[PDB]
Design a protein around this ligand. Structure first.
Ligand SMILES: [Mg+2]
Ligand SMILES: [Mg+2]
Ligand SMILES: [Mg+2]
Ligand SMILES: [Mg+2]
Ligand SMILES: [Mg+2]
Ligand SMILES: [Mg+2]
Ligand SMILES: [Mg+2]
Ligand SMILES: [Mg+2]
Ligand SMILES: [Mg+2]
Ligand SMILES: [Mg+2]
Ligand SMILES: [Mg+2]
Ligand SMILES: [Mg+2]
Ligand SMILES: [Mg+2]
Ligand SMILES: [Mg+2]
Ligand SMILES: [Mg+2]
Ligand SMILES: [Mg+2]
Ligand SMILES: [Mg+2]
Ligand SMILES: [Mg+2]
Ligand SMILES: [Mg+2]
Ligand SMILES: [Mg+2]
Ligand SMILES: [Mg+2]
Ligand SMILES: [Mg+2]
Ligand SMILES: [Mg+2]
Ligand SMILES: [Mg+2]
Ligand SMILES: [Mg+2]
Ligand SMILES: [Mg+2]
Ligand SMILES: [Mg+2]
Ligand SMILES: [Mg+2]
Ligand SMILES: [Mg+2]
Ligand SMILES: [Mg+2]
Ligand SMILES: [Mg+2]
Ligand SMILES: [Mg+2]
Ligand SMILES: [Mg+2]
Ligand SMILES: [Mg+2]
Ligand SMILES: [Mg+2]
Ligand SMILES: [Mg+2]
Ligand SMILES: [Mg+2]
Ligand SMILES: [Mg+2]
Ligand SMILES: [Mg+2]
Lengths: 138, 125
RNA sequence: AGCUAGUUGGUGGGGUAAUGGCCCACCAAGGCGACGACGGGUAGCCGGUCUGAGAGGAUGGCCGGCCACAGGGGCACUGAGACACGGGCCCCACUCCUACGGGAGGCAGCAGUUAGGAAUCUUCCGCAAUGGGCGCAAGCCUGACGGAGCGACGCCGCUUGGAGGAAGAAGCCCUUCGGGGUGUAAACUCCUGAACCCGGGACGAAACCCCCGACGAGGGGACUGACGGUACCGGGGUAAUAGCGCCGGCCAACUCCGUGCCAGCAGCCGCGGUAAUACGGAGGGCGCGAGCGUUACCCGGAUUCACUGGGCGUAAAGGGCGUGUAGGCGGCCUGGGGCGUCCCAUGUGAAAGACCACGGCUCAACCGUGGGGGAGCGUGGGAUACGCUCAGGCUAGACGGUGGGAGAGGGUGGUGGAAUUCCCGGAGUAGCGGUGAAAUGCGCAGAUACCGGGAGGAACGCCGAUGGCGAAGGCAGCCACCUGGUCCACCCGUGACGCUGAGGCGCGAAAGCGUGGGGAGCAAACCGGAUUAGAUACCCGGGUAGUCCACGCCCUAAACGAUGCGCGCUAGGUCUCUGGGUCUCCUGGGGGCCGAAGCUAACGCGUUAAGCGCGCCGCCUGGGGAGUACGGCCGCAAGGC
RNA sequence: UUCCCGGGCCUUGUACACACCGCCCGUCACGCCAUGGGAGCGGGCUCUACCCGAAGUCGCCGGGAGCCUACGGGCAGGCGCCGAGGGUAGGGCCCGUGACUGGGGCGAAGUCGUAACAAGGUAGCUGUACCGGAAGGUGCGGCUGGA
């Protein structure tokens, strides 16, 4: 019955990226739409659009991959190596401004929901807020 | 388990078991002997090891191994119990301290004389 | 797993500095509890301390804060304050003096004795300092305190010399006897020089006091040290304590002799039974050094209670299955609030401790100063993405309508034939049964085989399938009735009604039990006959409960897919069952095989997950003792949880 | 080429690997350790009812009986409630102990048999019921952890 729409979306993307697909569909939410915007600016995907499927609004999330490499298993590298929901609906995780993770020692991104909108780990500490730690992506 | 179950049911603790009941965890506990005898070891080894049943001041009567080569222990000897077991001897989980009380240490033991209670040879040495 | 008599609440009093069932009358029947009441066991609590990468775990000795005690127990008095450690009264235990009737005493204050124990100190000095009490002051009291004494109990600092020195003494150890080692080590040469003798010898001390100014501000003067002749400084000055653990692997350090599963070692693996780096010694070496080891306990390793950070198909572990209460969790759009949540300042977070500096004791331990943030909670202000709530609204979730579809789904009642056994009649004879082979047994008293008639019970061949239905156990001749689940189509209705589910409740194979029927075949037990060393078995002949029915119990299993349910996502090839269609083919549900990606220790799984995610429940934490013991609940009992 | 012995390759199964001259099971016997039940015995803690009940607060009285400094009063004293505690009585929990008895565990070489591991010589396991010196056997039903 879709307990967690956002972990559903992140798992949608996690399964789409393992079989190297053009895009996959996820039902639309104004909050999901913000999270996909943040994934888009950082270069984890190529963008999105409010498509319509059977009178029901989904979101085509166009995937981005690495270059075709050589040797056995020429399947490319992922742009998203690891994406997982941190704060669960049964396990709420709330962080202040001084307690924010360093995702892959700066190389990754933490996405988290604050009173100043949906932000990243760098943007949250720039603005100085902290909030519900949505997910870590790299 | 789930976080809700861990809230409801919690996590248990190890709660160690005392391998030496020397009563208050005393490092040592004195008792008079009652029997000074020789016992045979377990399956893999073979000897006649020297043990003693000791009527502790804990109110316990326990066996105790008599280390070193040779002893001076009798039925009415007073002796200090140490702790630590002999694996080939079942029922012996505690050691006698030598050089403490009526029990004396090994004579002519000249290497590891901090153990087995032997005094320094003072022979320009 | 239930507790509750002042018990819960009220009214009016008593009482207190003061609220309050704190106590008392009268009234009402409440109060608490799985969010763990009540009860049992244990424990003084904290700042802090130990450990840890941290999250955590452990702990509360010194010191500071709080509490509670003062031989056991109770009570008041005085008083601002006590239920009063060195004040009072009473009861008991104990001790001491008694002229025997009635007195005295309370070291959990500083020392100290005794008992216990593995174990824990001086019946020291002084009010010079600080602090407390009384006092106008002088001063007096101060076992608070300042110090000293004892114990390597701990930490820190220092010494037992330094530099020279033989192709390398003696001793002793090993030797492939030539040599190698201890070893610059020592002997020996100088130089410095702990300890000890000698003189000086304090910081901690300046006030209280006195004079002036008025016993104010201010200036000046006087007395006073326990520690202690000690620290420290100067002069002189003698080479001057070293030990303990280990040397198989973890783990750094190897040979020789003795020994022979003996004596012995031991933390685990394990060594010792003739050539032992594992025992005993020696030589040598390694690790430390006024210590070194051992024991006992705490954290660590232990990510073996996993919040970080574990799992459950086969290793420990999915509840037998459903239903469902509490609880946990929950779709898309729009606003109100601003509880969760975030931010800002502010209040608090005592000191001490820890960290960062800078200093003080010749260094350090120790100590002083300054500084920095913690975390938690109060108040005020703000933010509204997510969670919550209130409200409006949506349809993908869910349920419902209409039209249908398959089925061993369930209960009741009825019925058909095949077969078995028995009874009757006919006909018919000398053997039939049975085994590996036999025997028991049945048979001339007319068997087995054949026919005809009759009774009775149980189970449904072919269909029938590696097939179907159900939540599970499970369900199979046919018929009728009553009845649940379920799948498809059409996108018509309500519209978030959702998922899971501790207890509860219901179903629950076989076997077993109770009461009453029925009993053809089969068949525990039991009896025979063989097989066998012996057979309480396997093989054969009989054969009772039971298997069948009704009603009531019983709750077990390899109740197995050894895989809980719900939803979302991630190649397909193929077989089969049942629906719909523009039925060549597509699509939906269901049952199978193979296999993308991915997962697994492998075996294997693979949209009928063991993949990738989320929600909820159950369970696991070495083998045995053990599903045993005790307690509890249930059962007629067996026994069950 | 069935059968007896030995050998060769493949494949299947194994709980064997000193390798089937293997391993393994349960009574029985001796010894020892911990332990359950047990006529009872001995304590500890606790609860309930009643009896006696000191000191002492409080409440009366303070009168045929005292004392007082201001007496329609105070003190002494008497009575009462509560009361530490002692006594009696019956329960609850816990601990030690008990003739005897049940099972468990250990003890290098004890007696009896062959249960399981290979189709273990009757496939095994299992719930249950009955039976047997012992493992175990058989009945009914289920499982693949077998053919
Ligand atoms: Mg206590
Ligand atoms: Mg750790
Ligand atoms: Mg103390
Ligand atoms: Mg005193
Ligand atoms: Mg003593
Ligand atoms: Mg003073
Ligand atoms: Mg001075
Ligand atoms: Mg080594
Ligand atoms: Mg040794
Ligand atoms: Mg030192
Ligand atoms: Mg841990
Ligand atoms: Mg976890
Ligand atoms: Mg199951
Ligand atoms: Mg349900
Ligand atoms: Mg919601
Ligand atoms: Mg707020
Ligand atoms: Mg502080
Ligand atoms: Mg609404
Ligand atoms: Mg409609
Ligand atoms: Mg049943
Ligand atoms: Mg039955
Ligand atoms: Mg019956
Ligand atoms: Mg009867
Ligand atoms: Mg028969
Ligand atoms: Mg035989
Ligand atoms: Mg038979
Ligand atoms: Mg059950
Ligand atoms: Mg199970
Ligand atoms: Mg299908
Ligand atoms: Mg059982
Ligand atoms: Mg039981
Ligand atoms: Mg060949
Ligand atoms: Mg073979
Ligand atoms: Mg007993
Ligand atoms: Mg067999
Ligand atoms: Mg059986
Ligand atoms: Mg039988
Ligand atoms: Mg069977
Ligand atoms: Mg079954």
């Amino acid at each position: 019955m879709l307990t967690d729409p956002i972990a559903d979306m992140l798992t949608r993307i996690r399964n789409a990226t393992r079989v190297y697909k053009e895009s996959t569909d996820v039902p639309a939410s104004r909050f999901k739409e913000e999270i996909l915007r943040i994934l888009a600016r950082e270069g984890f995907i190529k963008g999105y659009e409010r498509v319509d499927v059977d009178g029901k609004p989904y979101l085509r999330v166009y995937l981005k991959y690495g270059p075709r490499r050589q040797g056995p298993d020429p399947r490319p590298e992922q742009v998203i190596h690891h994406i997982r929901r941190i704060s669960k609906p049964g396990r709420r995780v709330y962080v202040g401004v001084k307690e924010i993770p360093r995702v892959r020692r700066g190389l990754g991104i933490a996405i988290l929901s604050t009173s100043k909108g949906v932000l990243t780990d760098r943007e949250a500490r720039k603005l100085g807020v902290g909030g519900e730690l949505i997910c870590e992506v790299w | 388990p789930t976080i809700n179950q861990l809230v409801r049911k919690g996590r248990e603790k190890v709660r160690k078991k005392s391998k030496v009941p020397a009563l208050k965890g005393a490092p040592f506990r004195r008792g008079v002997c009652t029997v000074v005898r020789t016992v045979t070891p377990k399956k893999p080894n073979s000897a006649l090891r020297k043990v003693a049943k000791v009527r502790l001041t804990s109110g316990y009567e326990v066996t105790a191994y008599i280390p070193g080569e040779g002893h001076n222990l009798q039925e009415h000897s007073v002796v200090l119990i140490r702790g630590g077991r002999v694996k080939d001897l079942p029922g012996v989980r505690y050691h006698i301290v030598r050089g403490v009380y009526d029990a004396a240490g090994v004579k002519d033991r000249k290497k590891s004389r901090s153990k087995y209670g032997t005094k320094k040879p003072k022979e320009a040495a």
